[PDB]
């Protein structure tokens, strides 16, 4: 109810740049995922759920068909690339090397996970080795943590001292991403929208009109 007793929404006109996130030419490795803050703009969510072809569109805590009717103080868009089978880890309470070591959602998550097959653009003949993921880490990530360190992981008793060797591994590994890989191992571009509400005037809303208020009912 962003003052909807009678229609009253912000007089803003600039559109939110979802295209710069969804239609980006290049995406980031999941270990080094990017985030874009969306603010001070009108967000037409109809251009998302009714356009394009997505493989996964799972919203937690909010229905996607009501986004054009709600307002938020901030909305964040996190984008990355993982395997098709690994998309199931992008959800609250999930486990796995992606959920634990690369991207973790909180249990009280309020947003939408959007994913689509990207094999025709994020995979090359000889194999795309530019997309990486974290294979080893001393503990699980906190919700929305972003670890970009390349410290040599000590798997054995002897200390590594920052040199690769016996039981001392480089923590990152490269996806293969070949166009003939099995569909479950093909690259999927994922984007996660987080809907943040603070004690502050809302800055992102759906396209609505306005009236002029009465001193009555």
């Amino acid at each position, epitope marked *: 109810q962003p003052t909807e007793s009678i229609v009253r929404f912000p007089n803003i006109t600039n559109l939110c740049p979802f295209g710069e996130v969804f239609n980006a030419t290049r995406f980031a490795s999941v270990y080094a995922w990017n985030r874009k803050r969306i603010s001070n703009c009108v967000a037409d969510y109809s251009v998302l759920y009714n356009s394009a*072809s997505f493989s996964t*569109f799972k919203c937690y805590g909010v*229905s996607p068909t009501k986004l054009n009717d709600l307002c938020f103080t901030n909305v964040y868009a996190d984008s990355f690339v993982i395997r098709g089978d690994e998309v199931r880890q992008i959800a609250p309470g999930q486990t796995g090397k992606i959920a634990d070591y690369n991207y973790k959602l909180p249990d009280d998550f309020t947003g939408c996970v959007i994913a689509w097959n990207s094999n025709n653009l994020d995979s090359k003949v000889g194999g795309n080795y530019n997309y990486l993921y974290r294979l080893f880490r001393k503990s699980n990530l906190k919700p929305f943590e972003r670890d970009i360190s390349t410290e040599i992981y000590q798997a054995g008793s002897t200390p590594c001292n920052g040199v690769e060797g016996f039981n001392c591994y480089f923590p990152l590994q490269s996806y293969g991403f070949q166009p003939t890989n*099995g569909v479950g191992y093909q690259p999927y571009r994922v984007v996660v929208l987080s809907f943040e509400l603070l004690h502050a005037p809302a800055t992102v809303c759906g396209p609505k009109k306005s009236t002029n208020l009465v001193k009555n009912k």
Partner: antibody
Amino acid sequence: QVQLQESGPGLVKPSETLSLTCTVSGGSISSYYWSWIRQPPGKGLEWIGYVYYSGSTNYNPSLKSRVTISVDTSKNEFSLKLSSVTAADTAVYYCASSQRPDGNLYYFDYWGQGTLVTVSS
Amino acid sequence: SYVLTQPPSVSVAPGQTARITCGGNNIGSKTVHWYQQKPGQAPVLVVYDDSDRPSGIPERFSGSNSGNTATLTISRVEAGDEADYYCQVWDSSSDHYVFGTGTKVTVLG
């Protein structure tokens, strides 16, 4: 457009495994979620599970231990296997799908005619 | 497991607006779809995305979803709408698709 047609036996013994097959025509299997839904006589609809064109599956938690859903892209069909059936498994089994992504926006607008499966001694 | 609760039967006069209620704990944060099933036939999608309708369904079908209550409104009720209606939603926490118990709308008179 896309039409779905189920096929399978109409009678199963009270302890054998049920096998069904949904033959899709008019279109392709690629890049969609193909589901199985059943309805006992005079009762409501119950979703069983789906199969993604990669082969990944998601099942009803009540039927997870007994359901197997496979897909054959080179034959344009997906199948269902339900082990250790019981009298409560007598139902009309439909196959359904849509062009919507998994979750929230997913619905069933492509339906089959439905084949009745009876579990009798 | 998630539960969608519907009344087993409701009845309306020919011409009025029939309403089918679909109850669920905080269902307003979920996307409700509706299906019509006539005897001896498969269910057909009549309402999707809370309130939209497919190209074949007439504009007298409409849907609402607000505060643990989703409502399917059928205006100008005719004899040929007497059928069984089910609401269907996807559960986020269980990753499951649930159907309503079912409602048999009978035209009075």
